[PDB]
Amino acid sequence: MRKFIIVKNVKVDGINAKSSDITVGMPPATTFCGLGETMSIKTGIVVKAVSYGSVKFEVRGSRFNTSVTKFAWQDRGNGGKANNNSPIQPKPLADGVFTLCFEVEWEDCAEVLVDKVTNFINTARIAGGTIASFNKPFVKVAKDAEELASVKNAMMPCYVVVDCGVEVNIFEDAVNRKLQPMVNGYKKLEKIVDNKHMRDKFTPAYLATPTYTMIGYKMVSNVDNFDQALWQYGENTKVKTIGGIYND
């Protein structure tokens, strides 16, 4: 809770709205945690936590039956019948504008970080989308908990995701509690033996399924503790927030 960097009003087009087989819409916090990890490994700067807020979002299409994207022949098994309307294999798309906050541990200077971040953002992606435009990053300094409200308020205006936990399961909680599920981690099922077609022959491979937790959307000025709005990697392949379950 020392150094934060803010990038607000980032326009991304063509975001992959399909996060799982039952969740279509906002990417989960895992996507932003992976983006932060990619920034850390590529840039060489340790990043602690990531916070994301939704300024605008819209899934392409209508209220129901979102959309279908046309496919093309790109495999080496055809050539005779590859002339008319390849099959679908549906994949939804959406368009959104977000705002990001990154917890950074860097004290060498004050202006080099802005340049190094701007260099990475110009060639980065958000859930497969392309970044159209963004504002100039700026750095905020927090020494204690009381001034954390200022760096929190620096993110206006946007809607931040907070964690409320699961009671029984997402299906019953969504109808009763009126919240929306989200993916917070993966559970391993069984180890991959054949390492031929994998993208890496050194990293161990696993079959995993998403684990669901229920979240809520809150205005930035209405957040009690800012530590509840920051996400980071946890134990047993999970993503958790610093402040735990959000309580009013």
Partner: protein, 301 residues
């Protein structure tokens, strides 16, 4: 024999964005007005082939539309393009096949590909059927704080131009290993007052409407896939069929129902296998293979 890997993938080297539409005047192009969509209902007859005894009944449909206001007579379409390098870098697999392909390639001329890609934007092929009915099309292109203005006709039959070279040479340098460049493109037309515009459509399951147009918060726009498709329509390097098409593996036009580069020993995969297995290809073949590799996709089977 150097058999190809089971799955081979590449990234997309040209990144377009969603084009935005505004209504301005020909002499007052400073202030812009957004174009909404709206919805209307039409009535007509039933003219369907094979159903002659049901042609005396009516037909009611609900559709969307988009047209300029009666006080504006100029459509402005604005968007951005990003060109990135790092070509010949597979995303999935490839430790010896990719290196052999890279060594066989890189002797091709990227200047022609860069010239054609920029010309498809400058001449005005990136904008679709909105082209017709316009007596004057103006293109403003901005890169590295150096603007250029084009009023070029003859979208087909790529010809030599003096102003397009200063962008083609920069794009050629980016293609064969560099960072990234960004080009801001604006198009002005003279369709007239109240003329209809044609934004992108969508394939959506049956709803209360019969024709739904793409929009972003109530403003008409165009899909990025549609913008990107028109840029790579440079495949002139086959036997016939002038007025070329877009570069795709097994180059086919599903709209017309025909598939060029069929099973007559001229494919992407056949040339790719032949290039790494000894004998090299001709200039047109490498220029096509490199251009298709610039376009992304996964190849396997």
């Amino acid at each position: 024999k150097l058999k190809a890997p089971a799955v081979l993938a590449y990234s997309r080297k040209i990144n377009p964005t969603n084009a935005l539409m505004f209504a301005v005047n020909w002499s007052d192009r400073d202030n812009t007005t957004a174009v909404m969509v709206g919805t209307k209902t039409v009535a007509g007859t039933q003219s369907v082939r094979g159903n002659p005894n049901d042609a005396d009944k009516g037909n009611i449909q609900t559709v969307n539309f988009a047209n300029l206001p009666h006080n504006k007579n100029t459509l402005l379409v604005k968007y951005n393009v990003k060109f990135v390098g790092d070509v010949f870098k597979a995303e999935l697999g490839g430790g010896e096949y990719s290196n052999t392909l890279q060594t066989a390639l890189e002797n091709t001329d990227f200047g022609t590909l860069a010239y054609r890609y920029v010309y498809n934007i400058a001449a005005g092929r990136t904008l679709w059927r909105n082209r017709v009915g316009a007596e004057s099309i103006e293109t403003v292109i901005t890169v590295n704080d150096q603007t250029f203005t084009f009023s070029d006709l003859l979208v087909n039959e790529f010809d030599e131009d003096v102003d397009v070279a200063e962008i083609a040479d920069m794009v050629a340098g980016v293609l064969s290993g560099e960072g990234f460049v960004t080009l801001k493109v604006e198009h002005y037309m003279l369709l007239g007052e109240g003329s209809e515009v044609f934004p992108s459509q969508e394939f959506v399951e049956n709803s209360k409407l019969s024709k739904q147009l793409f929009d972003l918060n109530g403003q008409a726009a165009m899909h990025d896939q549609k913008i990107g498709n028109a840029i790579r329509t440079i495949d002139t390097w086959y036997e016939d069929a002038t007025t070329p098409i877009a570069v795709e593996p097994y180059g086919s036009v599903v709209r017309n129902g025909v598939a060029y580069r069929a099973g007559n020993k001229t494919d992407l995969f056949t040339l790719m296998d032949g290039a790494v297995n000894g004998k090299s290809l001709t200039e047109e073949d490498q220029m096509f293979v490199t251009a298709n590799l610039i376009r992304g996709g996964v190849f396997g089977g």
